[PDB]
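yo

u said u wanted the structure for the complex thing, so here. seqs first:
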Amino acid sequence: VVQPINGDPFIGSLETPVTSSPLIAWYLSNLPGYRTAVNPLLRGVEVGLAHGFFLVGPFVKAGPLRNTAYAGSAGSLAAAGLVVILSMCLTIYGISSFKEGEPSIAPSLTLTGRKKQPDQLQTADGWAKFTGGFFFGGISGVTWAYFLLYVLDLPYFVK
Amino acid sequence: KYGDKSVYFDLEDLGNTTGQWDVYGSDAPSPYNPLQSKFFETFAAPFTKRGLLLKFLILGGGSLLTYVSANSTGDVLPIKRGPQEPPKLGPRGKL
Amino acid sequence: SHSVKIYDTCIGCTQCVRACPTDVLEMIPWDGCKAKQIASAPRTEDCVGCKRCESACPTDFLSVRVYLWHETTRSMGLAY
Amino acid sequence: DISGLTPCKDSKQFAKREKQQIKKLESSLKLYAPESAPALALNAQIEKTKRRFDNYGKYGLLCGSDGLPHLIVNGDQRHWGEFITPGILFLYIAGWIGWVGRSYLIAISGEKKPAMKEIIIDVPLASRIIFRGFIWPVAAYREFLNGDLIAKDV
Amino acid sequence: GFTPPQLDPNTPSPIFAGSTGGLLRKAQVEEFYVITWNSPKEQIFEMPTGGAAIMREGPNLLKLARKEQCLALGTRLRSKYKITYQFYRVFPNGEVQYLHPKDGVYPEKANPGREGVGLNMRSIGKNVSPIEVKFTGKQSYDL
Amino acid sequence: EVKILVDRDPIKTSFEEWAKPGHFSRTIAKGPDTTTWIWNLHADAHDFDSHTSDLEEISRKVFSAHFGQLSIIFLWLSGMYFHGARFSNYEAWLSDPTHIGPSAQVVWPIVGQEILNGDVGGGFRGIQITSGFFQIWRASGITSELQLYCTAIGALVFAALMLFAGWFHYHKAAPKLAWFQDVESMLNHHLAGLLGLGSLSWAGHQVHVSLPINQFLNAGVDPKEIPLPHEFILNRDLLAQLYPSFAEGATPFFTLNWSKYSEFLTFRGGLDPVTGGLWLTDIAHHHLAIAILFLIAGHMYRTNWGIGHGIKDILEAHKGPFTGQGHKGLYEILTTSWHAQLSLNLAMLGSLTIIVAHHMYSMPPYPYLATDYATQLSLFTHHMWIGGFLIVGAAAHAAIFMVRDYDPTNRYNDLLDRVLRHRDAIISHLNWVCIFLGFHSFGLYIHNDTMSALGRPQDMFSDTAIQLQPVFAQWIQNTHALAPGVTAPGETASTSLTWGGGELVAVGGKVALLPIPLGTADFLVHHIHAFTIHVTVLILLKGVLFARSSRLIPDKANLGFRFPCDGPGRGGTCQVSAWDHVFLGLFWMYNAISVVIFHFSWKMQSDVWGSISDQGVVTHITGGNFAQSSITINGWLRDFLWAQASQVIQSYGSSLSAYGLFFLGAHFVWAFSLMFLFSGRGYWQELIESIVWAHNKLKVAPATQPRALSIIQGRAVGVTHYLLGGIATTWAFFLARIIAVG
Amino acid sequence: TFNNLPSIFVPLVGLVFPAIAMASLFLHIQKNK
Ligand code: CLA
Ligand code: CLA
Ligand code: CLA
Ligand code: CLA
Ligand SMILES: CC1=C(/C=C/C(C)=C/C=C/C(C)=C\C=C\C=C(C)\C=C\C=C(C)\C=C\C2=C(C)CCCC2(C)C)C(C)(C)CCC1
Ligand SMILES: CC1=C(C/C=C(\C)CCC[C@H](C)CCC[C@H](C)CCCC(C)C)C(=O)c2ccccc2C1=O
Ligand code: SF4
Ligand code: SF4
Ligand code: SF4
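structre next:
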């Protein structure tokens, strides 16, 4: 089912099973990157929580102090630092890409041709709310990963 | 008209022509619980001013970095432990 | 963008513009040669700078001449 | 005895180089019979080395502290065999090459398509010219005086 | 005021199974250079975005990426298939600028009705040195 | 259907066209206005697709050119067999092959180069060759120098025959296009008739000549005492005294009682422990089975009779669901284009050369090959390089197809179109995985280097600090070591002894391929190899796909396959041509194969090769310093490059002195190449015009106008000098290193 | 404290001054008036 995007052959993409399928499109459409209708703050919270855990993963066990007793604590600290930096670069991104009050640069159309509402994430205040959610969610996910490594160390692998 | 037989240049609907599509941007409503959403709103609205967020991030991160590197001892980083070893005399005496 | 210039040594052979892939050039009438035509460069905004025009100018050095200048999205030849 | 260099006919390290190379070639000589081709070739190389060292001794070459002949180029009459006589021997041949080539290019210059004579070398023409560079130091001097060596701009 | 633009209508596009060399976000915020041509038969041609397309019998329409794409296509059309072509420029606001002949005639036939610009009435060596135009916007070649 | 369509006297045998150079092309057959003309005379010399437009003359030209190549190879083999016959110690090398250096070249004593004739052994002064011809000849049961001279004369005869064949098949009776296009018969013959009957005839030699002779050579018999090979053909009692199955003749064969043939057609896999090579008994059975297989495979394609698969009927039968029409059209773009076939055959022949390199060290097929570490190393390295070059040429000729012979109107294909339509996806994911592999294969070396430099060896990716063990390769290794058994009975041992459960084949003092242990360093370097291969495929596939069009140049095909650029516009569009892509892929193939042969040399010298005393303690050439030093780049610089280049540079005044000479020289030629790759034509044309003023001042203005090299020519000169220099550096380094410590 | 000043200034300089500098310079790049 490799017919082009929206059946439009002169747009540079295709509706292959990987892009446009009932399972993978649904998955890419019901996650906080593409929830264009809900406010960007909850989206950013979800995103930051997930990436905070994903970053605390390869800092405790993989790192300069992984074998020491300071593995979990200092690794979570480095993960929170990387999260602060990611919110930092997200912030300069929101400042540089769109200024203060312009309308959303997101597409106001869908595959079915409906003149949907534009994604307010791409606005200034919207991206700022998204960055705030990302920072809050990321620090929270870092400390929760630290908590789970603390109180529930035995089921997880140490190696 | 964009939906005609192999017509992709609706000059009125330039979004469908140029490819402006939310390819996966579902406009479905908030699937979160309202109470936790309000909780996150009230607890992350401080991080709403991107400029204040950036100033806070840079200054607090630099402060925490200096604090960690100044209060950490040599047990967590060997550079502050010091030599804890006698110095070797270099070639030709020491020169 | 680029500054294409046609000097008065042109013989009006129409190779500069038949080689130009971006419609920058066009032949106009003139009274300075046996062919009674000379090339002009109105659409310099569409000039990418490929110098196919001056790789086909059969003169002492050149008559058409491309000067590299402020590069925009269309002079840089970007589809994005 | 100039430049702090002892001659090779009265040098110690030069004879030491000789002895060392001869012992090296003799160590590779006790692996074959003394009448077979390898041993005969090794003995020939040995005599070649010994005569080489003795010839460098008898020519008055100057061997330094490292024991190798250091050639003198300054212009000392004793050491014109180092640079100046072979230098003239070179320049005579090199100007032969240049002069026969130049007279060839001038010979084909009055052709309809001269470049095909640089690809397909006219061997009769060159062979009639190939010995005309024997006298290059005088023909070139006259072409310089007559004005035929250097071209004029027009 | 002798040749009017053509104002391409909603014509059909060639049969093509879709590629990746098509229209990216440049079209969504800048021009994208529609081309229109008129085929005698349903034949097959190489697309400038890579791949083979099947042009339709009658008028066609292709929105590819940029000027060089449509002009390369049109040159291949005119030389290989002997077919009249004309292409445009479609800004995202809506305007459609006509560009390829701008006189109904291709830019090789010196047809009167076009003003000569980019025209220095001198040999190319008689341009002034840069010091003669130092600290001036005119670089070397606009006097 | 198929026929012998061939036309007589198409072209006249005459020197008239020799006298007119550049006759083949229109712009070249009018004269050298410039010097570039001569570079275009050689560049387009074999570009027959550009000389003519019809495929008939091109097919005849390349057919006779292949005949010239075969004449050249027959003359080359004539030289090798002759030099073995006259200028060699092969008659002495058979006596003590584990200690006599195989030598087949002697130099002339003129200018001191007679030092190159060294103590190879055998009462002979020459150059220690690393070709393995001596090992073949021991595997062919030569046992003489007369046989080698006769082989050289016969090879010279076949060279002259092939030369006459090219002349006959171009000038006297040249085949027309219907003859080449009958690929069905060509495959039926080359499978069954060249590869089938060739392997069958070699099995006959292996059974009648190599096996009985090596049964004596390995059994302490001097070559002068061995009966001649034909005495086994004339007298079957002597042949039967070792293999009694010959007393029954072909009655075991035709009655299908093959169980009474295992004396000489074996399946006892592994290496002959008396000489280190594979069992010739197994190789005879091998080539026999391969003969059966290619003989049944060459009766697959319909030629004239009702049986056989028409290849069109095979390709058109395969039509994918969302893959479109599928393989329809390919028979018409492969049979109406030599460049497509050239690309396909080059790619497969190159990967096959590499597989040869890989299977010739781990299953040494010749006697006294594994112990001739120089031959083993040189052969692996050689065939690896040939394979990389053939793959890179496959890219070049795929690109040439896409520019010239590709026609979606007449000679249409569906799958090629589908590949062109998402070419950006292909190149994007390849450009990603190259970066991923680059990072996670070389940044690991950088991490190990930094951790070792910061005094943190507990943080490297080593076999001691952080385990990156090749678990999958270790599993395949351990199951191929324990393969003799339930999965592969009747083999008596593993098919190779490069696996952990294998054993050591002690041949003389040498070790000859004990197991190879795979550690973290092997993981790192194998991912480096995957990385370099993936980048080479990125560059080359990108050139092939974008040979016709890109977002930058949509009319690139009209510019040609081999063009420099399309001007400084578009920010600069240098090297958009597929020629320039393959010119870059050459460098990346060089980096790839260089690190490959470095991995080979070091892993072998550290974990495989060495010397095993009679007590059983094997000491390797380096000392097992691969898994500890090949985790960081400083080990390759220190323990491989710096250390193992202590026998090529210390070889001044030795027999290995030409190796150090070419070490420095290939260094030089590489660096000299950098003058071409870095510079541009315009500077050199301006300099040439200045010295042309200096010449015109003296009436020495050449009519063939001195022009700086064309841009594409500067790139060609740069890449060829770069490759030649790096490759000759590596060749000298390897050969001197491995001949000295041996 | 003099032995503790590198521990304050090196993490300050080599990480924050890149943060401040690269951020402010990316903002200066991506600007419009
Ligand atoms: C010796 C007798 C002879 C003569 C007089 C001719 C004469 C001719 N041949 Mg024929 N030909 C011959 C033998 C001969 N051929 C043989 C033996 C073959 C088989 C290889 C061919 C195959 C052949 C083909 C395929 C073609 C010709 C063509 C031609 C014509 C032009 C050839 C030319 O100018 O290039 C002269 C070229 C050379 C003198 C050198 C060529 C290279 C030789 C074959 C091998 C080089 C080996 C060398 C050692 C390798 C380099 C390494 C080195 C650096 C160490 C001309 C009518 C062409 C023609 O008519 O097309 C219009 C053409 O396409 N010939
Ligand atoms: C530049 C080209 C080149 C050169 C100079 C060499 C040089 C050498 N090769 Mg290599 N080789 C090359 C290309 C080259 N090879 C390529 C492209 C292949 C892939 C087919 C091979 C495969 C190969 C093998 C398998 C062997 C060599 C061997 C040798 C050495 C002995 C020469 C010989 O003829 O012995 C006699 C030749 C043989 C014993 C080879 C047997 C024939 C092979 C297996 C197949 C037959 C070819 C077939 C008809 C065509 C391909 C069919 C197609 C389906 C792929 C010598 C170092 C031999 C060696 O190292 O011995 C110590 C050896 O065993 N080479
Ligand atoms: C089966 C093997 C095979 C065959 C039949 C061909 C045949 C052809 N190739 Mg392909 N090619 C091959 C292998 C092959 N090549 C390989 C292995 C590579 C990788 C490098 C290439 C890369 C390649 C490119 C990139 C191009 C070709 C081109 C060509 C065509 C013209 C070549 C020509 O006229 O040069 C005649 C011969 C020469 C000019 C001499 C080359 C000089 C070499 C480099 C000398 C140095 C190498 C030497 C071993 C080192 C010793 C130095 C010593 C002398 C001092 C011709 C159709 C060209 C083409 O089609 O143009 C449109 C083209 O552009 N090929
Ligand atoms: C050592 C020299 C060198 C290096 C490092 C590279 C690096 C690269 N080349 Mg180049 N290239 C080189 C020489 C080199 N090339 C030469 C001499 C040629 C001449 C032919 C080419 C031709 C060439 C082509 C034609 C192509 C490449 C490609 C690539 C990329 C593949 C690896 C990658 O991205 O993975 C990750 C990066 C590396 C492995 C590089 C080392 C970086 C280390 C691991 C970490 C760096 C530090 C880290 C980011 C911290 C930053 C600190 C901060 C202070 C800045 C990468 C950009 C290919 C490409 O772009 O597609 C992938 C490609 O198509 N190169
Ligand atoms: C003595 C000596 C020395 C020194 C010397 C000197 C210093 C010299 C100089 C010289 C000089 C200062 C010179 C100059 C010259 C100039 C010129 C100007 C010339 C010209 C020429 C010509 C022109 C020629 C030509 C020709 C010829 C004749 C040859 C061939 C041909 C031709 C044509 C090329 C020393 C001590 C070191 C050493 C010893 C020796
Ligand atoms: C050096 C160089 C040149 C100039 C190289 C020249 C033209 C080669 C020098 C002349 C050759 C050696 C021919 C002269 C030899 C002839 C056969 C004449 C014979 C004379 C006697 C030696 C017999 C380029 O044109 C170039 C172009 C693009 C990128 C880089 C470069 C580049 O680096
Ligand atoms: S190519 Fe040069 S000479 Fe010819 S028409 Fe154009 S400007 Fe005139
Ligand atoms: S540089 Fe290229 S685009 Fe510009 S006028 Fe010349 S040919 Fe046309
Ligand atoms: S630098 Fe050379 S290759 Fe690049 S655009 Fe200019 S002329 Fe072409």
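The two ends of chain A are 45 Å apart (CA to CA). Chain A touches chain F through six residues (CB under 8 Å).
cya
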